[PDB]
Design a protein around this nucleic acid. Structure first.
Ligand SMILES: [Mg+2]
Ligand SMILES: [Mg+2]
Ligand SMILES: [Mg+2]
Ligand SMILES: [Mg+2]
Ligand SMILES: [Mg+2]
Ligand SMILES: [Mg+2]
Ligand SMILES: [Mg+2]
Ligand SMILES: [Mg+2]
Ligand SMILES: [Mg+2]
Ligand SMILES: [Mg+2]
Ligand SMILES: [Mg+2]
Ligand SMILES: [Mg+2]
Ligand SMILES: [Mg+2]
Ligand SMILES: [Mg+2]
Ligand SMILES: [Mg+2]
Ligand SMILES: [Mg+2]
Ligand SMILES: [Mg+2]
Ligand SMILES: [Mg+2]
Ligand SMILES: [Mg+2]
Ligand SMILES: [Mg+2]
Ligand SMILES: [Mg+2]
Ligand SMILES: [Mg+2]
Ligand SMILES: [Mg+2]
Ligand SMILES: [Mg+2]
Ligand SMILES: [Mg+2]
Ligand SMILES: [Mg+2]
Ligand SMILES: [Mg+2]
Ligand SMILES: [Mg+2]
Ligand SMILES: [Mg+2]
Ligand SMILES: [Mg+2]
Ligand SMILES: [Mg+2]
Ligand SMILES: [Mg+2]
Ligand SMILES: [Mg+2]
Ligand SMILES: [Mg+2]
Ligand SMILES: [Mg+2]
Ligand SMILES: [Mg+2]
Ligand SMILES: [Mg+2]
Ligand SMILES: [Mg+2]
Ligand SMILES: [Mg+2]
Ligand SMILES: [Mg+2]
Ligand SMILES: [Mg+2]
Ligand SMILES: [Mg+2]
Ligand SMILES: [Mg+2]
Ligand SMILES: [Mg+2]
Ligand SMILES: [Mg+2]
Ligand SMILES: [Mg+2]
Ligand SMILES: [Mg+2]
Ligand SMILES: [Mg+2]
Ligand SMILES: [Zn+2]
Lengths: 114, 91, 69, 50, 120
RNA sequence: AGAACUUUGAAGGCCGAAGUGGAGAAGGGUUCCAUGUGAACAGCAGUUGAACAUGGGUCAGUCGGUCCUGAGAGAUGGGCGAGCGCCGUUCCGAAGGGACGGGCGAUGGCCUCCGUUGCCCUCGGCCGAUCGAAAGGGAGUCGGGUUCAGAUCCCCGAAUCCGGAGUGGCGGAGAUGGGCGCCGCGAGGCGUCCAGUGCGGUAACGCGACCGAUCCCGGAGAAGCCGGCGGGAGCCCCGGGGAGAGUUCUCUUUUCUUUGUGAAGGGCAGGGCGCCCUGGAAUGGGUUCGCCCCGAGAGAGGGGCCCGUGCCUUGGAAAGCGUCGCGGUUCCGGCGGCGUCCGGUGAGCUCUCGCUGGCCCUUGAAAAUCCGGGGGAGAGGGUGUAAAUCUCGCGCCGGGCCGUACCCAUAUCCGCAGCAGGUCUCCAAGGUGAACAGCCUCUGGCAUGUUGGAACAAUGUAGGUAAGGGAAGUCGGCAAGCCGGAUCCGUAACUUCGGGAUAAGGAUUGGCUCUAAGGGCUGGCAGCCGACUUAGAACUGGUGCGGACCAGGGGAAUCCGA
RNA sequence: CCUGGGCAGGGCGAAGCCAGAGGAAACUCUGGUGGAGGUCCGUAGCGGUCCUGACGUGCAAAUCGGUCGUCCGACCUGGG
């Protein structure tokens, strides 16, 4: 029944004025300010979309607070790939390099036989 | 139950804008709202993006198709002429 | 604030310098010991009054003690 | 304002190590991941500029 | 207010004349369908997880609950009882026929063994 | 001195959460507050006021500007112009004054060891200086109290951000292991060699830290609207307890108020995953309100990760609130006791989070800042001695400038004014009710809108009726009035087959009793616990039932415009 | 043009989806489900049809009371 009131001089329901309401220990409903949610980093331009797992999804100005455990995964290409890209790129690099070696030795045999 | 007999998907409009115009818009609305078989993953997940763009749900391989179908028949004729002129007399 | 679980950790932090306020608050079921060292508030809560008495005995006498009622 | 789709094709710079991103007009039937070939003696397929 | 709420709980002041909105406005048909079908679809889960309905009849009665056939929980439970009583008869008569065929083929195989012993 | 108007008690009313309430942006500039006067202004009046005179009042690292670009505005290079000047924003420009590393020279400080200055080599798309949001982007403060006027600013208490560290403030990582030979019973010690820019889990990934330069790549910033559905909070409902108050003509275990945990850190619920392993399915299977998913791996089992605004814990009961009692003239954010509890449920309203779908010749913004990854150029102790670095726990110092009062309005704005006019927003209770409709109440405001007293004449302005006829008045059914909500039957001509359609036309509607149906939770069918809906029947009231309010007259046609 | 804010409840019931029935097949029919639309009644909001109502030296150098049209959008609106 207690109607509550703004605290800043931001009288419009904008995107930055995205709030909640809590209860004070002095038995009074207060209008508290909520920081906007930060999303986790995501797919690297071409794989199935989905936020990368193991990263504290905060603002990048909170990533100055965040240390070097909750921003990446210990694997190489940790905080950039969701490891399905890692297991694809490793096999893709290996297969294409081995097939280029096979094409090179086939051209060498063609040079030797012709 | 067959609720509508002639209008089909166009019954969202109603009594307006003419029988011939609604009949000509019916086939291409069915064409833009129908799901199409993805040629890569084999699924039926080709959903229409903005005009000219088709998008498969699985494997995320976005393709540039026709404005109202997945492949224009004139474009298939163009593709046949391009492969014919490719393998005709070695360019 | 921070809740210290071990007795020896709170004891070593109380002997640690630049800690100017130690408050003792008894209660109907337990007792809380407060260190206001610098920008943090360290609380050792314990329910055994004999352990509270021996920790008050082992409290360093060079530092001031404030009792809360 | 354009009914034709835009195609974002990234290239490799043969002079300094940097991946250059350009904006082609998307031809009919091209898909993401298709290798677009450009140059004089490029083999004639749909999507290759020559 | 509490006396009037107790009267509404007993079922008074709810005649035809003191209705001012439509039936969909009073009790929505979508909400009635949601409650009805959630109950009729989790009773099948409590049957299937415990003992009652198997893997194959679950999907059939699932689609039959999705269709507007089963009105409520009582006739759903009675139709499950009817299907179980039909399955018991269909397996009992098949077991009787299988027992007759098994005894006939066992007698045929044993007499074939007797004639094989007579040959060699 | 003086009261229909000032103030207080009391009585009766209005605004009734879409306010006549609590606060803001623009605008006003002292109107905000206290004291005194009432000539002057307030259209009567005043002891009153936004009038007059005097004296006060706005305190910020964490509220905003300042930073960034948006549409755009703009100067130099350049071109044009008699000319103040004009065009243009990459065009026709020698439009970077920065930096890693190395070498040489000089200076200074404890010349141990470091810090500056000059020269050379090498690197370095700015999409071009600069401006442009008090609603866009933008790191980080919340709880209590304080005055006559302040409040996230002041006091107490409790936190967080951004910069600083040269003689490198304290720890902890890095970091201390293995092998050989000799002595010693052994623990251990000695000589020598080698390694040591972290570990674990099959995994998704986790931790107290984890060398990183020019360069490259990626993400955040960074996205439309509308349905649905689920979780969380706040408010509302009910049952019991505790504290105070109202009624008692009679009844009423009755009626009204209240019944607390902030930011921050840890743990545990709940939600979610297009995240992994085992494992292979068809008699196809699993799940949604709707969908959807599955051999490119479904069901099932075991895991991992994200949000955790929810609960507990330090904060935190010493405050705060209710109630009772006691001391000081006063000053003391006095003094003492008790309580500040147990639960249930929701087509309940608002906000928030998450999943999914639809709509499109509409694809729904950039930049400042910040992070990760690839690359290994380089750096350091090299041994029984400890470094190169730390995005880990602490500790120390600083955060400059500007605005902060009040109205935000049928009286502080604009309209010549205390003008039925206009001006952009957040919060929203109880009942009836589909409804944030209309009506009556609660918190909270008010004196009826620049005057009072007496009577109820003509005429007028708004409201309601009227025997019989029902449009005969009038250019014309102008105005006014009939149907109006809901449930159950039934719906024509025509037609673009969608509609017309709530066509038209009939019946019922109150009160009080029952009956039937629609659910959840436990045990190997039985037993416990609650919501508002539908249908049927009986009894009865002066045919009375949408009882106020809420609110479609209908049909046949012609012309025009889809 | 950029940047933000807002729009109570009900009625009609499109595509898709489920189940059942008829038939020899082609195919047809029935009950749900779904929530489509420059869709209907209607509030706030925006405009102003009629009473040619009230004023008409008015509150106002254009306002007010009923009766109104539209209200998910070719919608209304602040700032630059
Ligand atoms: Mg802002
Ligand atoms: Mg429905
Ligand atoms: Mg008066
Ligand atoms: Mg009075
Ligand atoms: Mg208001
Ligand atoms: Mg004043
Ligand atoms: Mg006067
Ligand atoms: Mg006076
Ligand atoms: Mg004055
Ligand atoms: Mg301060
Ligand atoms: Mg700020
Ligand atoms: Mg110019
Ligand atoms: Mg010039
Ligand atoms: Mg600027
Ligand atoms: Mg104030
Ligand atoms: Mg405060
Ligand atoms: Mg710091
Ligand atoms: Mg919800
Ligand atoms: Mg809830
Ligand atoms: Mg918390
Ligand atoms: Mg203020
Ligand atoms: Mg006014
Ligand atoms: Mg006004
Ligand atoms: Mg209510
Ligand atoms: Mg009701
Ligand atoms: Mg509202
Ligand atoms: Mg007035
Ligand atoms: Mg008459
Ligand atoms: Mg009469
Ligand atoms: Mg008549
Ligand atoms: Mg007549
Ligand atoms: Mg006439
Ligand atoms: Mg009329
Ligand atoms: Mg009458
Ligand atoms: Mg006729
Ligand atoms: Mg009609
Ligand atoms: Mg004619
Ligand atoms: Mg027209
Ligand atoms: Mg419409
Ligand atoms: Mg109509
Ligand atoms: Mg109408
Ligand atoms: Mg007008
Ligand atoms: Mg008017
Ligand atoms: Mg007139
Ligand atoms: Mg007159
Ligand atoms: Mg209207
Ligand atoms: Mg109307
Ligand atoms: Mg309408
Ligand atoms: Zn695909």
């Amino acid at each position: 029944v207690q109607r509550l009131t703004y605290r800043r001089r931001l009288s419009y329901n904008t995107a930055s004025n995205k709030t909640r309401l809590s209860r004070t220990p002095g038995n009074r409903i207060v209008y508290l300010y909520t920081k906007k949610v930060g999303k986790a980093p995501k797919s690297a331009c071409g794989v199935c979309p989905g936020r990368l797992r193991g990263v504290r999804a905060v603002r990048p100005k909170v990533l100055m607070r965040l240390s070097k455990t909750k921003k990446h995964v210990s694997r190489a290409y940790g905080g950039s790939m969701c490891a399905k890209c890692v297991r694809d790129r490793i096999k893709r690099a290996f297969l294409i390099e081995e097939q280029k070696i096979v094409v090179k030795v086939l051209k060498a045999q063609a040079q030797s036989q012709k | 139950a067959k609720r509508t007999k002639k209008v089909g998907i166009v019954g969202k409009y109603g009594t307006r804008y003419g029988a011939s115009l609604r009949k000509m818009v019916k086939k291409i609305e069915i064409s833009q709202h129908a799901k199409y078989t993805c040629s890569f993953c084999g699924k039926t997940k080709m959903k229409r993006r903005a005009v000219g763009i088709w998008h498969c749900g699985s494997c995320m391989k976005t393709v540039a198709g026709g404005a109202w179908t997945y492949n224009t028949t004139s474009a298939v004729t163009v593709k046949s002429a391009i492969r014919r002129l490719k393998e005709l007399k070695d360019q | 604030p921070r809740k210290i679980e071990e007795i020896k950790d709170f004891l070593l932090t109380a002997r640690r310098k630049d800690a100017k306020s130690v408050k003792i608050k008894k209660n109907k079921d337990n007792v809380k010991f407060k260190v206001r060292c610098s920008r943090y508030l360290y609380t050792l809560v314990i329910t055994d009054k004999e352990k509270a008495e021996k920790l008050k005995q082992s409290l360093p006498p060079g530092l001031a003690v404030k009792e809360l009622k | 304002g354009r009914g034709a789709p835009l195609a974002k094709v990234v290239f490799r710079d043969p002079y300094r190590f940097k991946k250059r991103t350009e904006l082609f007009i998307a031809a009919e039937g091209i898909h993401t991941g298709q290798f677009v070939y450009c140059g004089k003696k490029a083999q004639l397929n749909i999507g290759n500029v020559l | 207010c509490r006396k009037n709420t107790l009267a509404r709980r007993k079922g008074r002041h709810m005649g035809i004349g003191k209705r001012k909105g439509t039936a969909n406005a009073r009790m929505p048909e979508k909400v009635t369908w949601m409650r009805r079908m959630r109950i009729l679809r989790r009773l099948l889960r409590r049957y299937r997880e415990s003992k009652k309905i198997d893997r194959h009849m679950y999907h059939s009665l699932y689609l039959k609950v999705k269709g507007n056939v089963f009105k409520n929980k009582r006739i759903l439970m009675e139709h499950i009882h009817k299907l179980k009583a039909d399955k018991a008869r269909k397996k009992l008569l098949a077991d009787q026929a299988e027992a007759r065929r098994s005894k006939t083929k066992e007698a045929r195989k044993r007499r074939e063994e007797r004639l094989q012993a007579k040959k060699e």
